[PDB]
Amino acid sequence: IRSRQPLLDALGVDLPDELLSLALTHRSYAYENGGLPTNERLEFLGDAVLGLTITDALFHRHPDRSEGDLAKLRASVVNTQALADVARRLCAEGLGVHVLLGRGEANTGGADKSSILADGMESLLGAIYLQHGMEKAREVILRLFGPLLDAAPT
């Protein structure tokens, strides 16, 4: 846990301490500690960044498939379940270990709630894009989602 280097490593980029902390701040932790900013805005941003990147890739990889099919192939790659699994294996400990959660949420399995893991994954993508820009975020995403992509066709 504690050390975030194995995480900054999985990601492949570097993130200032404050931004990475915000990215890992689930709302529960935020409320329990006096109304701290949450990773929700970052999640919102990361969702659009991930959405375009996966859309762009599928568009190029399947020139002959229809919008509808493309929409179906995308849904395979970015659903809550698929995102959470990327967080769970992002690094040895997994992402769950690094998420800041409230007492309640904490002992209720919070650190493994796919829901929370998916949101968290999106927040990080959001932070990366904010700190570095589209192309770097693109790289990182093509790497973490490189497999789930090849899988989508089936």
> Which residue numbers belong to the known binding site for Mg(2+)?
43, 119, 122
31 touches, from Ca ion, a copy of itself, none (C-beta below 5 to 8 Å by class): none
Contact 91, 6 (CB under 8 A): yes
Take residue 129 and report the two structure tokens written for it. 């894009």
Q: State the Cα torsion 84-46-23-12 to the nearest 10°.
A: 80
Determine which one of 67, 85, 122, 135 is catalytic.
122
Among a copy of itself, Ca ion, none, the one that 48 touches (CB under a kind-dependent 5 to 8 A) is a copy of itself
Smallest CA-to-CA distance from 116 within 27, 47, 3 is with 27
DSSP for 78-115?
HSHHHHHHHHHHHSSS-SGGG-B--HHHHHTTGGG-HH
Give contact residues for Ca ion (rule: CB under 5 A): 43, 47
Q: Which is nearer to Ca ion, 10 or 117 (CB)?
A: 117
- 31 contributes a contact to a copy of itself by CB under 8 A: no
Calculate the dihedral angle through the C-alpha atoms of 39, 43, 44, 45, rounding to the nearest 10 degrees.
100
Q: Is 93 known to be catalytic?
A: no
122 is catalytic: yes
Residue 16 interacts, among Ca ion, a copy of itself, none and using kind-specific CB cut-offs from 5 to 8 Å, with: none
Interaction of residue 55 with a copy of itself, rule CB under 8 A: yes
Residue 40 found at the interface with a copy of itself (CB under 8 A): yes
| Binding residues vs a copy of itself (CB under 8 A) | 40-41, 43-45, 47-49, 51-52, 55-56, 59, 65-67, 70-71, 134-135
